[PDB]
Each structure stands twice: as structure tokens, then as C-alpha cells.
């Protein structure tokens, strides 16, 4: 209870600064006019673009990752007007989890959705036009023009789409006597940037510098077309950027269309841009607008903490540190051997290394004999696409397999796409629908804690747990809360159906060894006594579309099971509670990996969450029209009807089985400024969470970690990121000692935090 105290009393100065930062009116002339964004649309190339200042404010919340910086965000949300966003979908869901654990937070989306990022922008040439900054000292106008030229192929499209959409909106209400506060409510589906000027971007170090200006730019857009009351009040955006500046980095990928060499360079993140740019540190006044959270809560060690301090603050590496980290070094052939460290996540510094490691363990488990099962993943290229693109690349000679030499990464979610063991691509022309299709096999493991990568639609088919676990679900109605408060009737219908379907399970437990004849006699006798105040008999299920029905018909079934669970719980003591209770709406038989959910009826249709830790179960086919929302896309929809698409089944933390949909992703990049839908990749998009790259590890914390370090490529920032993903130093093993080997340390942002920790106007929260 005393843990929150420091945050509780130190976030108040933060709150008492963001308020004046958000309630500061700009001069009339400094407000970006609508005509500005009209001219931006007219401009074709980002060269004649006029030097235009877009005013903004910042407030920086830095601090160790997992330093509980979210308490500050929590206090901000419940006190201030704010639009909470996230740099990654995982981070956005993590903030939602930690904001709805205290009060109500509206669905937290990504900043990309907030400024209008759509599908076609994903693969867009974001680094093309040049800029010779008339700078040193770099004017803010020049920096903003650089960040708009960087994102010309995104800023221009956003401006054009927003502008050419037409005017009503707030313009209408404002003239009530010529009430815009009640305008976003009455006029719905309006962009969330029209109702607040405090934009919280969490884990903002995962965003490049180009985005910062972009966000501000977009803010003004969405407040100019709609003529928001904030625009009439001459308010300016304030970007509360929350993230770890020394545990997070942003990378830019460019693909050269002749060499087929996809390159990824390092970039300046928003945090580093704001901390280390003399122009932004003055305009935004970071000295009076910086909060550093300094405590590592999860950590409960002492020497582990000192090492984190020296690595994060750039302190000199001493002999004692070398001797401490010496106790973690385990051989190269010990980490890579799958027989060792079971259940420990293994980090490598190369995607090829992860592709090697995942394959060897697959062989190990398969030979030793979970189940190493094989599941189809396909691809769909088209003849016209690879005809025209080959024409435009100045090289019309290129084989399709050579097309898939590197664009397989750039055809779907990169993370799992380049970190999966898979077969040989069977690229066969299926031009029936004018197409050429590929076919490989992404072997998984059976019954492992896998994670959903992309956005999937979960369809819960039932619960495979214990009688006690299902009694708990009904008692607290936790399941109902996961579906949201606006549509509770749908959640109550399916639970009702389950209870009327799971009555047979009690009768199987009736056949349990070690029970007296009269013990079972009293069992069935109390079953009869409860039927007297209720045997399945012939209960009439179902209800009309009425709110009262799901609070009367369900109320009976909820009380029926609750009682029934608790009834036999007392009769058989702990044995009944631990007994496995499986409830499904259909005859579900699961021999080996293959499952069979018969014919679905879409009793409860929901959306799987990426953060939710699921468990791989098996690939039932049971073609559901719920996932078959297929409408190019129809040409492959016909083939998906042809070849039965397998729907992989996952088990959530509670234990409810959920059948999910597949994933489809486009590749559109070109060089002739002709973005055309080339290839759509149909696969599963699940990750093992057992092996990954250090760079991706930055995003999410891990329980047990074994780090495989490649010598020569040793960057102390990578070592710090890898070693900081786990709370306890006890469960940490490593290839070599990053402190004892030659390491390229880049301690430039470290001294900047140190000078920030050495400034009277910077607020440090313990």
C-alpha cells in the first residue's frame, strides 16, 4: 500500500504542469490556417513546400522500462483531458490493461490510427526525397519540413484524403446562434484528435523522429477541417511522450528494387530527437518539462540493480561488474541445445540464428517423442503484378523464387515471417482466378504458450478446465467483463447455452474409482434433491432479444450451475473441484492434434487480443462463415473455398478454447510511384515466445532468458536490453560476458539523461 506513495505524491507536479502546457493560447497569426493544408495538397513534390511552423508542446516521461511509469499515465487519464495512444499495438493493449485496472479508459488505439494511417501506407516509400537543411542553427521550421519531406508519401496522402473528402461537422454547431463541446458526442465516428490536445504516446521511443512533427501536423489538420473548439480557443498540441530512452530504438527499412537487398538502418526516435536536439530542447523547454521515473519495481535483487544502473547511466564498467556477470555465462552449445533450459526464452542477434534454433528443437522433440505438427501456410502472387513490376525494375528478368528470396519478409508481419521454420515454397500458377500461388509448411509445437501476432477474430467454442474454474468464471462474471459493457447480452446467451450443454459432465465423474457405493448413492440422491428444487431432464433453453431475458433465464442457469458446482464440491470435497470440466456447444472430439467442432453457429463472435497468452491446441477445419468474411481478395477467396483453410485453435489463460481466422497481407511497394496490390500472404501469424531476437525483445518482458551473443557485433545497448527483460537475475543465462568482451558502447543519450538528472527543473519520481 506504501508502494504507490512516491508516485502518488510526485505525479502531482507533473499534472500541475501538463495543465498549463495544454491551456496556453497561441497568438492568432501563429495558428496554422486551413489554407495551409489546402496548399499542401496542391504541392506535388515536397520541395516547393513553404517553411511553415506548426506549434506544439511536449512533456517527457522517461524512466526505466517496467519502472511503473504507467502510474503517471494512470493519474493523467483520470484527471486530465487526454487521448492515450501507443507506439505498438502490444504497448497500446498493455496500457489499456493497466488503465482499465483502475478506472474506465476508452479503447486505446495506436497513434498511427489516430493520425489516419491505413493499409496502403504500410508499404510506402518513406525515405525518398532529399533535404539540404538551411540550418546550423536548425530552425524548427526546417526540422518540421525535413520530417514532412521524409514522410511526403504519407503526409500528402493523409492531407489529400482528409481534404478531398468534401462542411457540417463542428462548423455547423459552432453557428448555433451565429455547443461544439457536445458535438463529438452527437456527431459520432469523429476523429479522437478533435476532442483533446494532450496526446499521450507510450513507448514513444519505438517511433522515429519523422513521426513527431507528423503527429503535430496531423493534429492541426484534424482541428482545421472540423474547426474544433480547441482551434477556436487557439490551443496547441502537447505530446506527453512516455518511454524508455535507453531501452528502445527505432529502425528504418528501405528495399532496393534491383539488388533485392532490404536494408535496415538505425534512426533517431522521438525521445532521442527531443532530448538531443538543441532546437527542440529550447522550443519545447525540456528542462521545465521533463519527468524521470527512477525505480525498477519488479527487480528484487541488489547486484542486478547496480548492473542495470551502470548500464543505463553509462557508468564505467569495473572489475566487480565483470565478476558478477561472470556467474551467468553458460557455453554456446548449452543454450542452443534444446534439451537444456526448458521453458526459457532464448534471444539471438540474428533472424537466421532463430530460424536455425527453432528447427533443431523441432527435430529434438520429434525424434525423442508435445507433438511437432505440420500446418499449411500459402502465398498468392499474380502474373500481371510480377510482369509489370519486372518491367518497371529496369530488369525484366527475375524468377518468382528469386522474387520470394527477400519479399517473403516484406509480404506479412516481419517478426514471425523471418523467425519461423518452414518448408520449400511450391509456387504453382493457379491462374484459374488469374493467379500464381505458393505453398510451404510452418511446423509448430503442440501445447505451447504461443502469442498472437496480428489481429485475429477469436470464436470461443467452450471451456476445458475444472469445475472450480468454471464456478469462478460464473461467480465473478469475469468473462462478461472481457466482452465489454455495451453488449453483455451476447456474453450471457453463450454461458447459458454452455451450462445447459455441460450437464452430462457431472454424470461422467459419477464413474470415479475410490468412491463408496453409498458415497455415489448420496451423490445421485443430492442430484435428485437439487432437481427437486430445480438430472438434465428437459430444461427449456434460449431467450428472446430482451435485456431482462439474459438477467432472468441466465440468472436461473448461473444459479443452477453455481449451486450444482458447490453442491457436489461439498459432496466430493476437493476431488470434484479439481475434476476436469469441459463444456462445449457441440460434440467436440480431439484425437491427437486434429480437433472437430462439427458445425458452428457463431454463438459468441469476438476478437483475439495479441497480448493474451494463448496455448496452441490443434487445427480443426470446421469451416466457419464467421472467419469467412472474404469478399484480388475474391480471386483467392474462391481458392480458399477450394482448399479447406485450416483454423488453428488456441487456449487462453482461463482455458477457454478459441478458434481463430487466418491472416492476409499485401505487398505494394514499387519505384515508379505506382503502388499496386502485388501479393497477398495467407498464413496463421502465431509466435512461439520461446525464441526471438534481441531487437523485438525490447517490446515485451520475459520470464526466463538465455541470451546468445555473437562476438564482434556486441553493442552494450543490446546487452542491456537483453539482460533487462527479466525481473530476477537468478533466471538468466548468457553465451559470453558482454562486459568482458569488446563492446561498442554508444553513451551519448546516457550523458543527456545524466545532465537531466542534474537539473533543478527536471522532476525525478522515485
Amino acid at each position: 500500500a506504501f508502494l504507490n506513495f512516491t508516485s502518488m505524491h510526485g505525479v502531482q507536479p507533473i499534472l500541475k504542469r501538463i495543465r498549463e502546457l495544454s491551456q496556453q493560447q497561441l497568438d492568432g497569426a501563429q495558428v496554422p490556417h486551413l489554407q495551409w493544408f489546402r496548399d499542401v495538397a496542391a504541392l506535388e513534390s515536397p520541395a516547393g513546400l513553404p517553411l511553415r511552423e506548426f506549434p506544439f508542446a511536449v512533456y517527457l516521461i522517461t524512466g526505466n522500462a517496467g519502472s511503473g511509469k504507467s502510474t503517471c499515465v494512470q493519474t493523467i487519464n483520470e484527471v486530465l483531458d487526454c487521448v492515450v495512444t501507443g507506439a505498438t499495438r502490444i504497448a497500446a493493449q498493455n496500457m489499456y490493461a493497466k488503465l482499465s485496472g483502475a478506472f474506465l479508459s476508452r479503447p486505446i488505439n495506436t497513434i498511427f490510427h489516430e493520425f489516419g494511417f491505413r493499409g496502403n501506407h504500410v508499404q510506402a516509400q518513406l525515405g525518398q526525397y532529399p533535404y539540404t537543411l538551411t540550418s546550423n542553427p536548425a530552425s524548427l521550421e526546417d526540422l518540421q519540413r525535413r520530417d514532412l519531406t521524409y514522410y511526403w508519401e504519407v503526409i500528402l496522402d493523409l492531407t489529400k484524403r482528409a481534404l478531398a473528402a468534401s462542411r457540417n461537422e463542428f462548423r455547423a454547431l459552432a453557428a448555433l446562434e451565429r455547443l461544439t463541446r457536445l458535438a463529438p458526442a452527437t456527431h459520432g465516428a469523429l476523429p479522437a484528435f478533435t476532442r483533446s490536445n494532450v496526446i499521450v504516446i507510450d513507448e514513444a521511443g519505438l517511433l522515429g523522429r519523422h513521426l513527431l512533427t507528423a503527429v503535430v501536423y496531423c493534429w492541426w489538420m484534424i482541428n482545421a477541417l472540423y474547426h474544433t473548439p480547441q482551434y477556436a480557443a487557439r490551443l496547441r498540441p502537447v505530446l506527453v511522450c512516455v518511454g524508455s530512452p535507453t531501452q528502445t530504438a527505432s529502425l528504418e527499412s528501405t528495399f532496393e528494387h534491383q539488388k533485392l537487398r532490404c536494408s535496415v538502418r538505425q534512426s533517431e526516435n522521438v525521445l532521442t530527437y527531443l532530448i538531443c536536439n538543441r532546437t527542440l530542447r529550447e522550443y519545447a523547454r525540456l528542462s521545465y518539462s521533463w519527468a524521470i521515473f527512477i525505480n525498477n519495481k519488479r527487480c528484487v535483487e541488489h547486484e542486478f540493480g547496480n548492473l542495470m544502473k551502470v548500464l543505463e547511466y553509462g557508468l564505467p564498467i569495473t572489475e566487480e561488474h565483470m565478476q558478477f556477470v561472470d556467474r551467468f555465462v553458460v557455453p554456446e552449445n548449452y543454450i542452443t541445445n534444446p534439451a537444456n533450459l526448458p521453458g526459457w526464452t532464448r534471444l539471438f542477434s540474428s533472424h537466421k540464428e532463430v530460424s536455425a534454433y527453432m528447427a533443431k528443437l523441432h527435430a529434438y522433440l520429434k525424434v525423442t517423442r508435445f507433438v511437432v505438427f505440420t500446418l499449411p501456410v500459402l502465398t498468392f502472387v499474380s502474373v500481371k503484378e510480377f510482369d509489370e513490376y519486372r518491367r518497371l525494375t529496369h530488369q525484366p528478368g527475375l524468377t518468382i523464387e528469386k522474387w520470394l528470396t527477400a519479399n517473403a519478409s516484406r509480404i506479412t508481419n516481419y517478426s514471425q515471417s523471418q523467425d519461423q521454420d518452414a518448408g520449400h515454397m511450391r509456387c504453382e500458377v493457379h491462374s484459374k482466378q488469374q493467379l500464381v500461388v505458393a505453398r510451404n509448411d510452418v511446423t509448430y509445437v503442440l501445447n505451447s504458450q504461443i502469442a498472437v501476432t496480428a489481429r485475429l477474430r477469436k470464436l470461443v467454442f467452450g471451456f476445458s478446465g475444472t469445475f472450480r474454474a468454471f464456478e469462478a468464471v460464473l461467480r465473478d462474471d469475469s468473462f462478461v467483463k472481457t466482452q465489454g459493457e455495451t453488449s453483455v447480452e451476447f456474453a450471457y446467451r453463450f454461458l447459458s447455452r454452455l451450462i445447459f450443454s455441460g450437464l452430462i459432465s457431472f454424470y461422467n465423474f459419477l464413474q470415479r474409482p475410490g468412491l463408496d457405493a453409498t458415497q455415489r448413492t448420496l451423490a445421485y440422491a443430492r442430484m435428485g434433491e437439487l432437481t427437486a428444487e430445480i438430472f438434465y431432464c428437459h430444461y427449456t433453453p434460449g431467450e428472446p432479444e430482451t435485456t431482462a431475458a439474459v438477467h432472468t433465464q441466465f440468472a436461473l442457469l448461473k444459479r443452477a450451475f453455481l449451486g450444482r458446482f458447490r453442491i457436489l464440491q461439498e459432496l466430493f470435497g476437493e476431488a470434484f473441484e479439481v475434476a476436469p470440466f469441459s463444456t462445449y456447444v457441440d460434440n467436440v472430439i480431439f484425437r491427437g492434434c486434429e480437433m472437430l467442432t462439427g458445425s458452428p453457429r457463431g454463438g459468441l463472435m469476438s476478437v483475439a487480443l495479441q497480448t493474451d497468452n494463448y496455448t496452441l491446441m490443434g487445427y480443426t477445419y470446421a469451416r466457419v462463415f464467421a472467419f469467412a468474411d472474404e469478399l484480388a481478395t475474391a480471386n483467392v477467396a474462391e481458392l480458399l473455398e477450394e482448399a479447406p483453410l485450416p483454423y488453428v485453435v488456441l487456449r487462453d489463460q482461463h482455458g477457454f478454447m478459441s478458434v481463430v481466422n487466418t491472416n492476409i497481407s499485401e505487398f505494394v511497394e514499387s519505384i515508379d510511384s505506382t503502388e499496386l496490390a502485388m501479393a497477398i500472404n495467407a498464413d496463421y501469424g502465431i509466435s512461439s515466445k520461446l525464441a526471438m531476437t534481441i531487437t523485438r525483445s525490447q517490446g515485451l518482458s520475459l520470464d526466463k532468458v538465455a541470451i546468445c551473443f555473437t562476438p564482434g557485433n556486441l553493442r552494450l545497448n543490446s546487452a542491456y536490453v537483453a539482460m533487462s527483460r527479466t525481473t530476477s537475475s537468478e533466471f538468466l543465462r548468457m553465451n559470453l560476458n558482454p562486459l568482458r568482451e569488446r563492446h561498442e558502447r554508444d553513451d551519448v543519450i546516457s550523458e543527456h539523461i545524466l545532465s537531466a538528472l542534474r537539473d533543478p527543473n527536471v522532476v525525478i519520481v522515485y
Binding site: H302, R327, V329
Partner: protein
């Protein structure tokens, strides 16, 4: 880059602060801080065309009747002067806007066998030449100027310039005794627990390092476990440490490093480096050590370490390969 006048004023402030520190360190002396001669030399880099550093050397006569003895004693004198010059508001006000790191004095040039570049000499890029900061009440200016040219004024063990009494300051403060460090260490024990020293932990496994060859007593039985580890995880050099004798080399109070030189096969047969596979001769140019330390919940951690003489591995740097429990 800095203007010379600001530098000269900062040097006057440095003279003031250093003389206060000297009159504090040597209490029975008489240092009038307006006549006591301090000598200054700057490295050539008017406009001080300094892009890297302003190389300075400050020479002070040790006031009579004192003589300082010991490397650590002058280390302490340097720390006192350094933390005394960053107290005078004039110095920090003058040079503070220019110094990126406020640390000015290096205290590692006083160990036995460590060299310091003399004034009136260059570096193989800057000939240290005097910069004259006359004492505010110097009664002989020409003498002060023609005092920078006398080697005695800039030599560590110069002849002191009819001695009745002489006071030898041969010891001052210790090392790692900062109040922040001593308070943090004490709070660590209160909140987290006692981490027993290496000697105490080794004493549990019947090792009393007071006598010679006692640590080798445990290193013997430890060799079998280490060899079993290597001939499983690192097999491509297996039959190399079958017969080796632990040779105690380095002894820190939390780090015992015993070399593993062999006799069998050849007396000088070098132990092939376990990592970074090299040629027949390049690989067999490495040394191996065993490191006993205290770790985890006070359990003796044994590490295998190597020192390779090849370019691929850090040359003459100690590396670790596996740490096993004991």
C-alpha cells in the same frame, strides 16, 4: 574555443583555491595566498585554438617544513585540491560554461612507474609552455618568471629549495571511503542481506587459505567437474586438460584465479583457446584459469576463463566460458 583572458582569470582562481587547500592540508606551514608561487604550463593547441583539450600542468612547492611521501599521499593531496577548486565560486563561474566534465585533475599519474610529460616538452603535438599567473602580491616578478625555467620547480622528487625540522606527510585518506558509498553499503545489508566474503564461503568447503596450496586442495576436485563440463559442451578440444595442475596466480579477496598450465605431453604445450577456432599454432597460444568467487545466495561459483594471444579474441584480456556451481 575559449578566450585567453578567461583562462588566465580561471587560473588565478585555481591558484587561490589550491593555496587554500594547501594551507588546510599542511597546517603548520605558512602559505600566504598572495605571494606563494604557483607555476602554470599550457599545451599548445590570442585565440586558444583548442578543439580537444586545454592541457595544463600546475606545479606547487610543498611548503616548508613539509615533505610528502607516498603515491597514495599525493593521490589524497590531488583529491583535496580537486574538490577544493570546485568550491571557489570564481573558478566555476569563469570556466564552468566551458568544461563539459568538471573533473580536471588526474590522480593516476602518481603510481610507481607511471610517467608524466614534463613542461617545455612536446608529445609525439603541443609543447607545454608556461602561462604566467603572477601572485597578487608578488614582491619579485622577474624571479617568478625566471622560476618556471628551473627544473626543480616541475620535478616530483626534486631537491627541496639550513633545515631545522621536517614534517613528512606520508599518509592521508583511504580509497572507496565516500560517505555516499559507506551509507549505501550499510543500507544494502539492512535491506537486502549479508553477502559473505569469499574466504568465509570457502571455509565451509574445508579451505583455509592461510596456508599455501590450500585453495588448490579444492581446485583439485573442481578440475574433474570442469573437465566433465568441457568434454560435453566444448568437445572439439577435449583431451587437453586431462592432466593439468592448478597454479595459484591472482588473489583478490573476492576472486581467486588459478592458472592451469600442464606438464603432460610437453611442459610448454600451450592450451588451445576454447573459442574462436584458429590454426594449429595460432590456437595453441592461449592460457587457461579457474576463478573461484562468491555468487547467488552465497554459493561458491567456479568459472573457467581464458587469455588468448590471438587478434580475433581481445589480446591479453581475460574472458569467461562457463561458471558452474560447487
Amino acid at each position: 574555443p575559449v578566450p585567453f583572458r578567461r583562462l588566465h582569470e580561471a587560473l588565478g582562481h585555481f591558484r587561490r583555491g589550491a593555496l587554500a587547500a594547501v594551507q588546510l592540508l599542511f597546517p603548520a606551514a605558512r602559505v600566504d595566498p598572495d605571494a606563494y608561487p604557483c607555476y602554470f604550463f599550457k599545451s599548445a593547441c590570442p585565440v586558444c585554438s583548442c578543439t580537444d583539450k586545454i592541457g595544463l600542468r600546475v606545479c606547487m612547492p610543498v611548503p616548508a617544513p613539509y615533505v610528502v611521501h607516498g603515491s597514495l599521499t599525493m593521490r589524497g593531496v590531488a583529491r583535496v585540491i580537486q574538490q577544493a577548486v570546485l568550491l571557489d565560486r570564481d573558478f566555476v563561474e569563469a570556466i564552468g560554461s566551458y568544461v563539459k566534465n568538471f573533473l580536471l585533475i588526474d590522480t593516476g599519474v602518481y603510481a610507481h612507474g607511471h610517467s608524466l610529460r614534463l613542461p617545455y616538452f612536446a608529445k609525439i603535438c603541443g609543447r607545454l609552455l608556461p602561462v604566467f599567473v603572477i601572485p597578487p602580491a608578488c614582491k619579485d616578478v622577474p624571479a617568478f618568471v625566471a622560476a618556471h625555467a628551473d627544473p626543480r620547480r616541475f620535478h616530483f622528487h626534486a631537491p627541496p629549495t639550513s633545515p631545522r625540522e621536517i614534517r613528512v606527510l606520508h599518509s592521508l585518506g583511504g580509497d572507496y571511503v565516500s560517505f555516499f558509498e559507506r551509507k549505501a553499503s550499510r543500507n544494502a545489508l539492512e535491506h537486502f542481506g549479508r553477502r559473505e566474503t569469499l574466504t568465509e564461503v570457502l571455509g565451509r568447503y574445508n579451505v583455509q587459505p592461510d596456508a599455501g596450496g590450500t585453495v588448490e586442495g579444492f581446485a583439485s576436485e573442481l578440475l574433474g567437474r570442469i573437465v566433465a563440463c568441457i568434454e560435453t559442451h566444448f568437445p572439439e578440444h577435449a583431451g587437453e586438460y586431462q592432466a593439468v595442475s592448478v597454479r595459484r596466480a591472482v588473489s583478490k579477496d573476492d576472486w581467486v584465479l588459478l592458472q592451469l598450465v600442464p606438464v603432460r605431453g610437453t611442459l610448454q604445450q600451450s592450451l588451445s583457446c576454447l573459442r574462436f577456432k584458429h590454426g594449429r599454432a595460432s590456437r595453441a597460444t592461449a592460457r587457461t584459469f579457474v576463478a573461484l568467487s562468491v555468487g547467488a545466495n552465497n554459493r561458491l561459483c567456479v568459472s573457467l576463463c581464458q587469455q588468448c594471444f590471438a587478434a580475433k579474441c581481445d589480446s591479453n584480456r581475460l574472458h569467461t566460458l562457463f561458471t558452474i556451481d560447487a
